[PDB]
Ligand SMILES: *[C@@H]1O[C@H](CO)[C@@H](O)[C@H](O)[C@H]1NC(C)=O
Ligand SMILES: *[C@@H]1O[C@H](CO)[C@@H](O)[C@H](O)[C@H]1NC(C)=O
């Protein structure tokens with residue numbers, strides 16, 4: 217009986233714009249009369265459940281049980297407890313869901329680095345990296361937009377957060393968006409959206425352009441002489 | 445009896461980090477045992493209703509009650525009804541406020557405008573404006589932060605939304621942050637934050653500084669008289 | 675009751691080069707004995723109000739009043755009282771129309787702002803705004819002129835005056851001009867004029883174009 221109730225990630229919270237709690241049974245024979253429900257503080261019980269599949273190649277009952285509940289309820293510590301009433305165990309399988317309060321809350325520092333000059337000289341592609349550093353919960357979401365329109369998820373790839381060597385509490389992550397080199401030369405502005413809990417507005421946007429790392433000063437001095 | 449309530453705009457709920465709506469009753473006699481609550485169409489009212497204001501000396505109430513309500517439930521289209529029971533009106537008075545449905549949801553087109561040279565040449569101050577235009581509906585919230593830190597609301601003021609001349613459906617707004625010239629000389633982010641429901645992430649951030657724009661300056665210092673005609 | 679006595683703002687007197695007094699009749703019987711006051715302190719009667727409004731659908735009667743009063747006489751501070759002799763009230767309602775005096779006059783500091791780089795990069799429309807700062811009181815009739823010919827009122831929108839955050843006495847105003855990007859690229863010597871009483875000539879002009887907004891870039895030096 218593997219009731220792995222993994223809380224949805226913050227990227228999943230701002231991806232589908234809905235908080236779906238997870239209480240899924242793994243490695244168990246599919247049976248009937250399973251009355252799953254969520255019990256919280258003050259005895260509230262609101263639930264809608266779908267995605268029930270009788271047959272599985274691994275002989276594991278799905279019992280996905282995804283319900284839409286407001287984010288403020290999670291922010292209030294409602295301790296969402298799953299109550300899977302399986303036949304073998306008459307007592308409901310209690311699995312609580314709550315945010316691990318007590319962790320450090322450091323806002324990320326978003327830096328939109330310009331593409332390398334040699335790669336643009338190669339005239340093949342233009343990969344703009346979005347270096348996100350300094351976040352303790354390590355729950356970061358990176359999304360790219362062009363002219364205010366979000367791009368397809370397959371154009372940009374985001375690496376999983378990993379601990380920072382200098383700061384043990386803080387974490388860092390990176391993501392790259394690959395476009396054509398003349399697309400970069402066109403003058404389009406790319407915005408990197410970084411979603412995190414510690415941010416005052418929960419998101420942060422940085423804009424990159426052709427004129428973000430150009431040489432502000434040219435100091436050419438043409439000196440010509442006819443003597444040794 | 446002028447019955448009216450102020451619906452919680454997106455700007456207010458974005459500023460307060462919570463969704464709360466007020467029930468307001470005007471031109472009624474001063475009786476005790478006030479029972480006002482926002483009843484959802486399923487028949488379940490608000491949990492708590494506190495912070496009721498005190499009557500004006502002119503025998504007119506502007507009392508407002510606040511409660512914690514889910515934002516998804518409000519903006520999904522579910523209308524909220526306020527029940528008003530009092531000795532003056534034995535029949536239960538009802539109120540209704542709800543955001544309009546079917547209105548065009550177009551993202552704002554934010555273009556921050558750097559200040560002109562002459563305001564910098566004058567030594568009094570510098571004004572940085574964040575031109576927000578082409579957004580529907582009219583409601584919008586503009587916030588200014590410096591280096592990721594929120595600034596005081598007294599420094600920046602947001603203009604009231606007005607329709608765009610080209611398109612009647614869209615609207616445009618202004619927000620000016622007045623800062624000293626020496627602050628503009630130093631490198632500061634001075635981020636402009638625009639909040640709107642039609643945006644995907646609901647927040648648009650733009651940055652500006654002294655090095656913003658700044659076409660490349662050339663310093664050609666050529667020496668040619670050393671040849672002296674071979 | 676209530677009467678919509680709207681004093682003529684500085685914009686109205688600036689546009690028509692004359693003062694057009696307005697005292698809108700509201701909340702009165704449509705076809706009852708009505709006597710609106712249109713006399714000065716001395717009692718002289720102005721010319722009869724023109725363009726009388728028709729019968730409003732509700733019980734309230736509507737009427738548009740106009741008058742031709744001078745500039746300094748209207749600035750002299752005499753009282754233009756609006757009172758109506760009507761049978762629905764035993765006593766007539768008085769709402770005097772007069773300029774409020776004692777307000778400080780501050781010279782506006784207008785500074786036109788070039789269009790943003792992102793707007794010039796996306797290239798859908800070009801919005802040129804004329805920022806008005808440090809003007810008091812809250813009155814403005816800022817305009818927009820194209821190559822010497824003023825643009826249509828519909829093209830430009832003038833924002834309502836609001837108190838300045840740093841200076842409570844002073845106010846600010848906005849006036850955007852939505853134009854084509856190619857028009858800005860070609861250069862149409864757009865100009866902005868702002869109307870205010872505190873200026874020595876009541877209006878000042880600022881000129882902008884594409885070459886404006888571009889500093890000196892080419893510091894080529896010839897030395898011997
Ligand atoms: C540019 O070059 C000149 C000499 O050619 C030098 O004196 C000057 O310091 C240089 N500019 C900067 C910013 O260093
Ligand atoms: C431009 O060149 C002149 C002549 O060499 C020099 O004196 C000046 O400092 C330069 N300006 C810069 C480098 O900003």
Ligand SMILES: *[C@@H]1O[C@H](CO)[C@@H](O)[C@H](O)[C@H]1NC(C)=O
Nearest residue numbers: 661662663665890893894895
């Ligand atoms: C331009 O060049 C002259 C050459 O003498 C120099 O004095 C001046 O400082 C330069 N200005 C800039 C902004 O580089």
